[PDB]
């Protein structure tokens, strides 16, 4: 068809200029002349788009298409003397339909200035090696003979090198192997052997609580997850009980020494577990199952304090609403546990070390619950209704958070 601009827009323009009482044939005469000039320029701006080898366009093809038709590039003002603004363009006007049309000059200075990129640089790679396209990141994607393994000996040697580097004898070797896991596109069809190596490892690595072996395997899990190419939820049924035990298990190794390390490992386990519930989500299978196991870990009495601290951390890192609903009716039990560890003279065991960590973590989570959906007031002795664990020091932490909010 031949689509033109509407004539009922051309009469609005004419009567808002001083030219009143225009006929319909006078008004139809305006909207076929200007609709041709739009069609003449958009067909002529198409020349610059096809010769600019882009199709997408950069605000500027219409600026050269106008200059080609001996009409000035600038829009929003027309100079009848032509001399200060010749056919050089001014880049158009950054205007919108949902524009407020009113702005504060001070706000524009307040708004941050964007950074400037490195200048264009030249980088060569390989599309084809003697006919075959390589999988580099610059590329898009009764006697009978014995069977041949689908995995290659380069791939099997790669698996052996990556697994012997990921057990962390040297740190630079680990870090590359972790980046190699994080971005190898062909790491599918090797993924059963990696999942089995992880799963089997943690289970025979908690027989003796070897913390590095576990911290390296958890970093291997994290490096497996952020790889975008591979399909993981076929293997997550082996991945999730491995991270579960890491968080909810006792430490054969004494904790007064690496419990800080152990705590860090638990945090890593709780980070990956929250990611494992963020992805791979279907109805009522994964997130609710680990939530139920965490809550019955919490509810059961006389539970190892290492297991208690790990389950507390796992319950805490589950997001905004989960602590808004699951960390409310239980403060009295937490306080009673802290009081029992405090009473009595035996501190040799790991009980109180576990108690102090649990209380600190629970108190910080309470702080956003106090900040997110409550107003501060009576920060001296009202917390004694919650067994008086953090009290005024908790109030001081809340005040520091308020100061950080003021700085923001």
């Amino acid at each position: 068809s031949n689509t033109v601009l509407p004539s009922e827009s051309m009469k609005v323009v004419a009567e808002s200029m001083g030219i009143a009482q225009i006929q319909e044939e006078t008004c139809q005469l305006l909207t076929d002349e200007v609709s041709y000039r739009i069609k003449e320029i958009a067909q002529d701006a198409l020349k610059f788009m096809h010769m600019g080898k882009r199709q997408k366009l950069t605000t500027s093809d219409i600026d050269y298409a106008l200059k080609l038709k001996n009409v000035e590039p600038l829009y929003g003002f027309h100079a009848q003397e032509f001399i200060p603004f010749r056919f050089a363009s001014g880049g158009g006007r950054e205007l919108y339909f949902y524009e407020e049309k009113e702005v504060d000059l001070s706000d524009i200075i307040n708004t941050p200035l964007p950074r400037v990129p490195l200048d264009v640089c030249l980088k060569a790679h390989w599309l084809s090696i003697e006919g075959c396209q390589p999988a580099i990141p610059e590329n898009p994607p009764r006697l009978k003979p014995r069977s041949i393994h689908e995995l290659s000996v380069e791939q099997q040697l790669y698996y052996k090198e990556i697994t012997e580097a990921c057990v962390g004898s040297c740190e630079a070797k680990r870090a590359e192997a972790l980046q190699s896991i994080a971005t190898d596109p062909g790491l599918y069809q090797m993924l059963p052997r990696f999942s089995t190596f992880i799963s089997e490892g943690v289970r025979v690595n908690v027989v003796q609580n070897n913390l590095a072996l576990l911290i390296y395997l958890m970093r291997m899990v994290k490096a497996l997850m952020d790889n975008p190419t591979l399909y993981l939820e076929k293997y997550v049924h082996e991945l999730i009980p491995a991270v579960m035990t890491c968080i909810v298990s006792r430490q054969l190794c004494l904790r007064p020494d690496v419990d800080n390390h152990w705590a860090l490992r638990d945090f890593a386990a709780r980070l990956v577990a929250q990611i494992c519930k963020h992805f791979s989500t279907t109805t009522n299978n994964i997130q609710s199952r680990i939530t139920k196991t965490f809550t019955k870990s919490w509810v059961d009495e006389k539970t190892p304090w290492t297991t208690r601290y790990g389950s507390i951390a796992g319950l805490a890192e589950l997001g905004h609403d989960v602590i808004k609903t699951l960390i409310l009716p239980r403060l009295q039990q937490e306080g009673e546990r802290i009081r029992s560890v405090l009473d009595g003279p035996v501190l040799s065991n790991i009980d109180r070390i576990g108690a102090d960590h649990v209380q600190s973590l629970l108190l910080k989570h309470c702080a956003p619950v106090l900040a997110k959906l409550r107003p501060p007031p009576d920060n001296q002795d009202a917390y004694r209704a919650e067994f008086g664990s953090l009290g005024p020091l908790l109030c001081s932490q809340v005040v520091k958070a308020r100061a950080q909010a003021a700085l923001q």
Binding site: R203, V206, V207, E233, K234, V236, H237, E238, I240, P241, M244, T245, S249, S280, T282, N285, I286, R289, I290, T293
Partner: peptide, 25 residues
């Protein structure tokens, strides 16, 4: 939709806590 392979995925049909040995023989 119950016919979808997601229902037959091992993770949906497998309980992780039961799978963990937890040093149990």
């Amino acid at each position: 939709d119950l016919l979808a392979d997601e229902n037959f995925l091992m993770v949906t049909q497998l309980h992780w806590e039961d799978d963990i040995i937890w040093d149990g023989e």
